[PDB]
Amino acid sequence: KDIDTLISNNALWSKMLVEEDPGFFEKLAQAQKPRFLWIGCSDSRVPAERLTGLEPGELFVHRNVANLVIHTDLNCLSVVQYAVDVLEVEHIIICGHYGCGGVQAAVENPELGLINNWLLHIRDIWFKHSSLLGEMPQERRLDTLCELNVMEQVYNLGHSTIMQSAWKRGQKVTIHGWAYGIHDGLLRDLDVTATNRETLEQRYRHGISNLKL
Amino acid sequence: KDIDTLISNNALWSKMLVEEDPGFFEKLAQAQKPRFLWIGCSDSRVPAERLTGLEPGELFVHRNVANLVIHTDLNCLSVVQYAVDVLEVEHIIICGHYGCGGVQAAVENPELGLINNWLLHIRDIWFKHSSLLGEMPQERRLDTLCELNVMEQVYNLGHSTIMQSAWKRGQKVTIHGWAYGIHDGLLRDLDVTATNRETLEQRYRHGISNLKLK
Amino acid sequence: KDIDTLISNNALWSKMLVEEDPGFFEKLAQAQKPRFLWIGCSDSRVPAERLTGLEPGELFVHRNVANLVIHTDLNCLSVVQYAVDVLEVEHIIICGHYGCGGVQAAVENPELGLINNWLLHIRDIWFKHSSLLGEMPQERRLDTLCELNVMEQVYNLGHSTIMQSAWKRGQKVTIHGWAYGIHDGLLRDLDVTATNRETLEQRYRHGISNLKL
Amino acid sequence: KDIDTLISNNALWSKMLVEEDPGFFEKLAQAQKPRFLWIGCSDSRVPAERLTGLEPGELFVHRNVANLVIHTDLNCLSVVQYAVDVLEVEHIIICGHYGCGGVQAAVENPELGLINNWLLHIRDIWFKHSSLLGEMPQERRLDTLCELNVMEQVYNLGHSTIMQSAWKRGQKVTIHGWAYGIHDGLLRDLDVTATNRETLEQRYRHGISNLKLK
Ligand SMILES: [Zn+2]
Ligand SMILES: [Zn+2]
Ligand SMILES: [Zn+2]
Ligand SMILES: [Zn+2]
């Protein structure tokens, strides 16, 4: 599969649809605003649509290395502000994946270049949860960190001006922390679901509590 | 559809893979590195893997409002630098889409909040090609702006220190600018494809010249 | 002058003041909020205070390479938002300097590393004003670009959500574009002063008009 | 004082230099590169050149709300990378100040607008040392937080790829963490000074340990 394949793939996939499944494009035209914002990793190991069965246009997507929400990344903050205040999504899903290359790179810490600064936000989680991660056998620490990262970015998202204002003014927005494995593509809920400032703190605090012994 | 629906859709998707297509999670077990970086818009009207037929794990992907490549957005630059220097993708594709609401709102300029600052980069492109855009019928402008955007993001991408270093050190990295519409999902090459500094400039200049045509 | 000098410098400069000029620190305690926001270059060839005679605490300062306001730099945008909405400054001054190393680096374009991406925002001005800059003798193009850069960042600052909202709601905020030379430290007004959206566009458009022949 | 005042102050400053101190603009004509990068807070209660007595042209300077060094702020990273790789400064100084309104508002947490997102990085430091901060009298906390901030920004700076690369390739670059108050302008070494990876970690750890003392 080279570039020349992608275009002819597309040209025959579009031609089969207009000939055979015309409602696909008509579904897109009558597609309403998305109700889901998906924040995922650039690895995109399984695409979000196939993972959840969402139709085209039903979800708004952001992706960056290791699905981060940095307090001061305007790229991601601008996706969220537009999602919550303009489109008025009802669910934000943050989704990590076990075996993510960014997360593993943050632990091994090779000299990769510019990307290492982005990843410093994960080394910080790794060191924040040092004792929690220590208590566990070596072979589970990478997937645990993948989970901790997702929980921390849920925590970060809820603490931003976008979500703070939305919840203060009563807008119904729910944040979910998810992860899936490569063996089964089975979504796993990290159980840190937040619907307001109150549940944000309790569920986060409980989420960290369950990983500890 | 609510959240429990997605969970049950996911469960029923997982099983119809492990029984019908077991060589799927195997194909993903083997960490085979993506050959393509797709920079698209968060709108994701038609998912990239559907538009192209690429298997999961064959594309590295970044998505923001209106598929921008801003010279000093560390988020997208981190994605690009990781794709080029670590994964060593051979092709980067910036894909816009006609009818893009980020491009619409840049022009209409409602008071949306934080996002209007992101959108000023698009309004910059609007004003830059004001003349070109005026020589056209009004109904054709928004879509020309969607094409101008992609073409300027390709220009910006080629100018990043990442792309400059890779091209100077001999790494084959080709950059493409595409767009599609909702009526057929047909990909449209904007013809600003670049493989080194010289083609970056000549194809960009050629791309702005061909919109003068009609 | 090494590090050890700076500390003992400070320890005797503070000691002379408390002994001899105590009103300096008492002026600081009763110092009200600043009325000026200064956005300048990291070169800081002449410090802003000596350039204008402002007392300590009278100005709020941001500095970055080549005094830029990028549409989406949250570092600078956050300084401005805090300056305009919290401190309620009355004047924002953007100040470039002839002979700035960032501006010159953007034209010569050496392979400097990470910084070159920041500077791409100036190469863009250089190419935006290609014909205007061409019409002039080679030896004036660098200082002209220094001036164009300042005007463009005034233009950018006025177009941000911070200033747009402030002017819509009637807040009196004035943006100034300044530059000084190294031969005399004489401030030069670029005459693109904006007090609302209307003057923003007229003065910017006139500022570019005066550089052309 | 309004704008015309600054213009006339500037004019009367220029002349009292060219007549009384002509070897000032000469000293600046010679492009002698700064040996110091000062990362301070936009509050600039006492200008850095006054605090230290450094001549103009001897310091490269960056200033933001609460003198932050965020891992992914390209603005400050650009300043640092230019100072270390091009100017080759030998010392970097991050200087906080007691009474800093950015630190105050991080704790008090009013609904200020866009700036609260910048300030979340400080609230992160507050929560991190919650225990340390609680073993102290309340009136001493805000100032301890001002010191904790500087110490964490030094930690962050030392971890940037810029500082990692320079230390690994042998470039003498020393990083310092300082603070001062308004009552005397006396500089206070926070003692987290670092010259390589090993001292970065040990001085940081030692710095958080010594605030447990009293
Ligand atoms: Zn990943
Ligand atoms: Zn779009
Ligand atoms: Zn400069
Ligand atoms: Zn401060």
Numbering used by the authors:
A (entry chain A), C (entry chain A): 2 to 214
B (entry chain B), D (entry chain B): 2 to 215
Per the authors:
Here, we report a case of persistent CA2 contamination that crystallized in three forms. Two are new crystal forms and the third yielded a high-resolution (1.43 Å) structure of a common CA2 crystal form. We report two novel crystal forms of E. coli CA2 that was obtained as a purification contaminant. These lattice parameters can be added to the list of crystal forms of CA2, saving time in the case of contamination. Sometimes, as was the case for the data sets resulting from CA2 crystal forms 4 and 5, there is no match for the cell and symmetry in the PDB. The fortuitous discovery of a CA2 crystal in the previously characterized form 2 from the same protein sample revealed the contaminant. Additionally, we report two additional CA2 structures in new crystal forms, which may save time when others encounter the same problem.
Carbonic anhydrase (EC 4.2.1.1) is a zinc-dependent metalloenzyme that forms carbonic acid from CO2, a byproduct of carbohydrate and fat catabolism. An endogenous carbonic anhydrase frequently contaminates recombinant proteins from E. coli expression systems. Here, the serendipitous discovery of two novel crystal forms and one new, high-resolution structure of carbonic anhydrase 2 (CA2) from Escherichia coli that arose during a crystallization campaign for an un­related target is reported. The presumed Zn2+ ion is coordinated with tetrahedral geometry by Cys42, Asp44, His98 and Cys101.
